[PDB]
């Protein structure tokens, strides 16, 4: 059991924002 | 040190929104 | 060291709606 | 003890919409 950290830099520009965007953090300290 | 994590870092550009993009991060922290 | 580190440097510039990306990102440590 | 470390640095500037990239990538530091 360790510890754990999600971080995520996300610049994300779409002039016309029909999008298709997908994002998952799955993200474990082992419970 | 016994931990994970995630140091994802993404600038993103698109014009029009009919482009595809996924992501699926994890991470699991057991040492 | 201990356990399981990442990471990403992501520079995505396509204008045109069209663009398929698909990322799948894991960073085990197990019992 | 067992520890892996992943990286990498993603460019893509595409003229004519065209790209596709899937990009699955483990690791694997203890099992």
Do not use: C, H, I, Q
């Given at each position: 059991?360790?510890?754990?950290?999600?971080?995520?830099?996300?610049?994300?520009?779409?002039?016309?924002?029909?999008?298709?965007?997908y994002?998952?953090?799955?993200?474990?300290?082992?419970?």
């Open positions: 059991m360790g510890a754990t950290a999600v971080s995520e830099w996300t610049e994300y520009k779409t002039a016309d924002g029909k999008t298709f965007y994002n998952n953090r799955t993200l474990e300290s082992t419970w």
